[PDB]
């Protein structure tokens, strides 16, 4: 029973090998107080982590140490590691092999130093970082297809056929989950509300969590909700106010399907995944279209499966069956697959024991994965 | 009353009484090792041996007629064998007058419920309930009285002219009553046993443009639901969308038809097994005691060594269980002879007689051996039968000196891989193994089970890497050997003369096979090669 | 008498507060079922329309193929 | 008096939301019955056009 702990920027999720459900999951916020201490004897904590920190955002500043699949400001991410191991999952690492997760190709130096930091101080027995998509594939029991996890920090595609991780068509994209929230900030300024600070900026992803459904034929649905007041929806902040969101409701997620709104000049996800399809052989396209699997988070938006099916079948020749696999086990499929992989006995020989690292130097992760 | 083992004519009442004497001296538990099953003609031996031991009470047997019905299973060869292990212990205090005897079953064959072999037949109880005799209980149980209607039963032959419970249903019902059962629990047992059949009618369809499974055949699901009381709609729903927790338990969802067909069978198997063990608890209840009983001499009955045609997973499991006890025997006799020869110390040949078996124990169990490969293979995506054997050949051929391949097994269907045990080279074909061991213990239905009749909640309230029969089995066998690790052994065997049942006269074809299988020849091998 | 009158009106306010809280939670559950049902009917309406348009296209493909086959 | 009006308003809004839920669930229950029938007719048409195109070739 080793361990499995996701790295992804949004929600550091911790659990045990084999178990079908992460034992503890919490947002990866790291907080610091932004005002002087006034009631002597508080015994203030000098930093806060996770849902404890999220509890009292009122006097807190929020640093996400994980942006775009790059681990920045390593001090706080180490703090998150420390809080995870001891408080959430509650075992010393000294007696548990550990496995982490990592987006396709983020930088070179990232793993090459992260293995060191988590392998020298925490003194873990053994570790092996596994690229996200291949793990996602295992999680669904399909050993052939294209993965689109789009974990909040980064979105990417891989072609995987008959269990081969065909590298060169890996098509990464930085259309992250958080940036939908950030754009929603700018679109919500227009209806007259304002969300300047950081705490409210955290709230808005919550308000995004429920009220963002992507709709087919964006033009017609847009003019539809413009003409009729049918879908005018309401919601309340933990303030007392109630906020009325109009067509922003379905103008949020469509930044995914076209980035012209956010500005980035890189085609929407459907065109990228079709691209990565068309950058393989003329025989692998027979099956690839059939096993398309969503994964990660940021795809729990209702409808996105169907809209995706429409766009692809329009793009691909209308002689293939594009039936896409979108189980509702999403947002965790990363972790399920990770646990299953840690459960494979043949997998035991793979990862790196302390001896190899000590006698070989840090590069062992890249050299042996 | 003395004559330890080589001072009296050969006789086992002697050795059992010597065990009594050991109890008097060492004050420590003893274990009776009965080889062979009722299929070996044994049943009439410990039924007398136990009374013998009690001499220096009749409630012990009364359990047998009923517990047989859920435990006797007719096989391909040597039919009508109780395939479940029932370790049986009789407690003595420091005094020596019998205070009580509690009974605990070990390593029940949990996979016999579904995917039985076509040639063989299921548990006797199923066909007991089948026969129209006592049709009022069938009226309670809503069964149509036709074996081939249902999926689980239709695998069986259900026509065994040698022995059917048609008469035996009266005796089993009578015992099952007079063992102190209220009528409510009495007919509830029938209710659960029937429902375990009754799932077999469940039928599912593949959802459009999607993956999960919708329920088909509402009426049989509803009859089941009434039979266990719980609502049909929520049951089918908990089938189509099980709940999996998170850091806060949102109602997570996901299934596939194949997974569902596997899982419902898993649930049936688990509920039946736990039902059986609870009946064991009730048998303890009607036999309860309150005297100071602490020192017991235990008789355990185990399935015999199995070698015959067309042997799947089940045979591998049973054989492994049977031979581990021989590992225990070899180590034990080695210990005693070790100290004895030590008193005459000159030089020992080769310590730890147990190595002879360890050489194959590692192959069956030790990580990434054989049993581990099935555990890994069910987990791995797209379980396909042939890939299993491909992996085995890749991993343990030549690398393992006990994993080889047979050739042209004359008339019996082609086995794939073979092992060289001491008792007999074994041949298996691994068809259906991936199906056999996959069994996901769905939670949501388990939690749904609490709001029904007293039995099912009572059974399933008391009590994860997707437990599969292999792991549960290994753990339980380790439990058993632990209980024997904390005891001392002695050995009682049984011999069958012939199928024609002619007493007094030998018939060589059979006895040679049983003697070789039983491992008495292996003990003679140990003595022969050694001091 | 004034204390007795106050205590009876306070108990009436607590009873109305309990009833209001119960009504507010059932209002919230009715609203949640309504928004989920509205979303699911709108999503399924898009899917059935897509399948119906593909059926019309499949009928046109069949009709031209049979004409050319003849 | 304010809580008396609020209780009557809350029960009114409950029935309006539950009526809206009932209408949407009743319509989607009929739509769930229809969608598989139209998909089966599509699968029949797809099988027919595929064999007609093959026979044409
Ligand atoms: N109700 C919701 N609907 C849609 N998306 C959501 C909802 N709740 C959270 N999310 C998104 O899921 C994201 C988490 O995805 P991510 O962190 O990339 O994967 P992981 O958590 O496995 O690392 C959050 O950033 C958030 O934007
Ligand atoms: Mg995350």
PDB file of C-alpha atoms in Angstrom, chain A residues 216 233 303 306 309, chain C residues 35 46-47 50 61:
ATOM      1  CA  UNK A 216     -24.791  24.351 -28.961  1.00  0.00           C
ATOM      2  CA  UNK A 233     -30.972  32.924 -13.000  1.00  0.00           C
ATOM      3  CA  UNK A 303     -23.474  19.713 -22.199  1.00  0.00           C
ATOM      4  CA  UNK A 306     -22.444  16.952 -26.577  1.00  0.00           C
ATOM      5  CA  UNK A 309     -19.373  15.621 -30.254  1.00  0.00           C
TER       6      UNK A 309
ATOM      7  CA  UNK C  35     -33.483  23.882 -12.191  1.00  0.00           C
ATOM      8  CA  UNK C  46     -30.879  19.200 -28.140  1.00  0.00           C
ATOM      9  CA  UNK C  47     -29.906  15.493 -28.324  1.00  0.00           C
ATOM     10  CA  UNK C  50     -29.699  16.123 -33.362  1.00  0.00           C
ATOM     11  CA  UNK C  61     -28.780   9.052 -48.191  1.00  0.00           C
TER      12      UNK C  61
END
